[PDB]
């Protein structure tokens, strides 16, 4: 029984096996084989949060096999981004954001619809009161998994 490689938390994975003529298949959720989850030759496991194992029994012309099995491995949650400490800008001055980390992609969001997908976002010049608020960042790792969130609070001095 084979998996399709490591999966991100909450992702899906495609299990697969050999084609056996005259066979019916039964995939079970546990080692006791008391809970059936699929009868497909190559079923999908949906919404995997942790390492999980499915067991397979192949029955041919009425005779059942010894259950085979496979484990789908979940890729560790990526580390929190290195976002700066709370800062302050005076009206008319610049708000500069940056993250001291390395990612396959970055995802920033904030006040006034601010958004960017880089480590060094376009500087908010002529900063004003409406730019005050919380700027949030998550990042994506090399294999597509998303990190948790971290924030910097920006205050604006009149």
Residues that bind its own copies (CB under 8 A): 2, 5, 17-18, 24, 38-39, 46-47, 94, 96, 109-116, 118-123, 125, 130, 133
Nearer to its own copies, 84 or 111 (CB): 111
Write out the H or E segment, with its range, that includes residue 89.
strand 87-90
The phi, psi pair for 5, rounded to 5°, reads 100, 180
| Distance of alpha carbon 75 from alpha carbon 79, whole angstroms | 12
Q: Is 129 helix (H, G, I), strand (E, B) or coil?
A: helix
Nearer to its own copies, 105 or 157 (CB): 105
In the complex, what is the shortest distance from the CB of residue 117 to its own copies, in angstroms, rounded to a whole number?
A: 9
In the complex, what is the shortest distance from the CB of residue 5 to its own copies, in angstroms, rounded to a whole number?
A: 6
Q: Judge whether 53 and 122 are in contact, CB under 8 Å.
A: no
In the complex, what is the shortest distance from the CB of residue 122 to its own copies, in angstroms, rounded to a whole number?
A: 4
């Amino acid at each position: 029984v084979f998996n399709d490689g490591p999966v991100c938390e909450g992702g899906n994975s495609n299990l697969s096996t050999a084609t056996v003529s005259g066979a019916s298949y039964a995939w079970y959720s546990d080692s006791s084989l008391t809970s059936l989850v699929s009868t497909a030759q190559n079923p999908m496991i949906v919404n995997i949060s942790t390492d999980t194992t499915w067991y397979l029994v192949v029955t041919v012309n009425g005779c059942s096999s010894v259950a085979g099995s496979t484990t789908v491995i979940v890729y560790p949650t990526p580390a929190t981004p290195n976002v700066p400490a709370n800062f302050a800008v005076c009206e008319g001055d610049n708000i500069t954001l940056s993250t001291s980390t390395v990612a396959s992609g970055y995802n920033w969001s904030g006040p006034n619809g601010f958004t960017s997908n880089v480590q060094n976002p376009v500087v908010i010049t002529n900063a004003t009161a409406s730019n005050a608020g919380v700027y949030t960042l998550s990042i994506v790792d090399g294999n597509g998994c998303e990190s948790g969130d971290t924030t910097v609070t920006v205050t604006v001095n009149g």
